[PDB]
Design a protein around this ligand. Structure first.
Ligand code: HEM
Ligand SMILES: COc1ccc(C(=O)O)cc1
Ligand SMILES: [Cl-]
Length: 393
């Protein structure tokens, strides 16, 4: 009934160009079986969206990577939000929602925007820059650790720790083995910064620790909730901003439209998230026998969701392989969907919007002028190097 495929969605050849294999996964059927890892797969928008929005059947508390926490010990203590189901998910989620609230975004937006404008101004003085290291990485590193309340020392551990977490969702391949081998110094830094004395007043971390008296979370849960923001709060924003710059460099007609109307900045970033989906995949585990796409999936099975493929599914999107900054992006699953939908999405969108706004106002052309290098990770898509020449407006 359900087709079996030998495609390894965690192989370097797949990461190098995933789009043809994603069509093969979509067109084989609504539900596929991936013999390489003994998991079910869904690559069309409909089933990906359905799975995301049925958390009681497709649970997260047995892990959202390949490993099933009922069979293997997690490599680190489970996230209290990502790797929890309702009802235990619910109140920690509320605390993170309030810490990263619209009111919080309003407090920090002017400073985030000034830092974006300053970065672009600085980059225009140099002309030829690496849009990853010098822009997509440098800008989030210039705002988010300070907004967390982190000290200056040790911040070089943030991106490595985040890449470790993302690689550890994958199967036990070399990317995962090597990440875990190298983990100890990054993990030691991150866990220490999660303690209350180490988070500056008013920042995201301090506000989590201040939220420990309402009956929603306890003081001993605050360090792991800070850990969630330190795990997730940087590298996908980096990849999304780098993707937007890549798209504006590859599709100059869209940079021309963005320049003509800088209010398209927010949707231009949202479209970049759909187009390049910084998080390519997440898993769920079935809690019961379930019918999905005409298939009967037993209890205790891993289901791999292809978010990036769902965001390029022609069953859902017109011209899905075109970058269109005026596209109606609502409903894309680059941030997930449902109760786990990215609690930090307002932070990522704020950073992406104000960076693209600075580019829209200050830059006339973005020309690739060197070899583009891909960054490989079991669950993240992104670039390692993006040499561009920036021409001032
Ligand atoms: C473009 C940037 C980002 C992308 C593409 C992204 C992607 C995602 C996705 C797809 C999920 C759903 C997980 C699931 O369904 O199992 C998620 C959840 C989450 N994200 Fe993000 N994210 C981004 C930025 C951020 C930022 C900036 C933060 C923190 C400031 C963050 C923190 C979290 C957390 C804590 C969760 C777990 C929420 C829950 O389980 O209820 N993310 N993210
Ligand atoms: C990749 O997205 C996430 C989301 C949450 C967490 C976490 O809660 O630690 C890590 C990565
Ligand atoms: Cl850890």
């Amino acid at each position: 009934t359900i087709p079996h495929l030998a495609i390894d969605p965690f192989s370097l050849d797949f990461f190098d160009d995933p789009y043809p294999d994603q069509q093969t996964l979509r067109d084989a059927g609504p539900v596929v079986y991936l013999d390489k890892w003994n998991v079910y797969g869904v690559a069309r928008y409909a089933e990906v969206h359905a799975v995301l929005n049925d958390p009681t059947t497709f649970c997260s508390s047995r892990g959202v990577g390949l490993s099933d926490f009922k069979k293997e010990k997690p490599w680190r203590p489970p996230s209290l939000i990502l790797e929890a189901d309702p009802p235990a998910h619910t109140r920690p989620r509320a605390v993170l929602s309030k810490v990263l609230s619209p009111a919080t975004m309003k407090t920090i937006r002017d400073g985030f925007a000034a830092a974006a404008d300053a970065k672009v101004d600085e980059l225009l003085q140099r002309g030829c820059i690496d849009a990853i290291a010098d822009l997509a990485e440098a800008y989030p590193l210039s705002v988010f650790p300070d907004a967390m309340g982190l000290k200056q020392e040790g911040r070089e551990h943030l991106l490595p720790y985040a890449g470790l977490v993302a690689n550890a969702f994958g199967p036990p391949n070399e990317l995962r083995q090597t990440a875990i081998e190298r983990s100890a110094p990054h993990q030691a830094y991150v866990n220490e910064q999660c303690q209350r004395p180490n988070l500056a007043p008013g920042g995201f971390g301090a506000c989590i620790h201040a939220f420990t008296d309402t009956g929603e979370i306890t003081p001993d849960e605050a360090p792991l909730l800070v850990r969630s923001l330190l795990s997730a709060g940087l590298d996908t924003t980096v990849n999304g901003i780098g993707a937007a710059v890549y798209c504006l460099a590859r599709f100059p007609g869209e940079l021309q439209r963005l320049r003509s109307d800088p209010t398209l900045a927010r949707n231009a970033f949202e479209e970049a998230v759909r187009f390049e989906s910084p998080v390519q995949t997440f898993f769920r585990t079935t809690t019961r026998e379930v019918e999905l796409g005409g298939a009967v999936i037993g209890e205790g099975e891993k289901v791999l969701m292809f978010l990036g493929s769902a965001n390029r599914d022609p069953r859902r999107w017109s011209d899905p392989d075109l970058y269109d900054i005026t596209r109606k992006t609502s409903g894309h699953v680059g941030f997930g969907s449902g109760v786990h939908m990215c609690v930090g999405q307002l932070v990522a969108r704020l950073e992406g919007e104000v960076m693209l706004s600075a580019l829209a106002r200050k830059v006339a052309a973005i020309d690739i002028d060197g070899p583009v290098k891909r960054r490989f990770n079991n669950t993240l898509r992104g670039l390692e190097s993006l040499p561009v020449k920036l021409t001032p407006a």
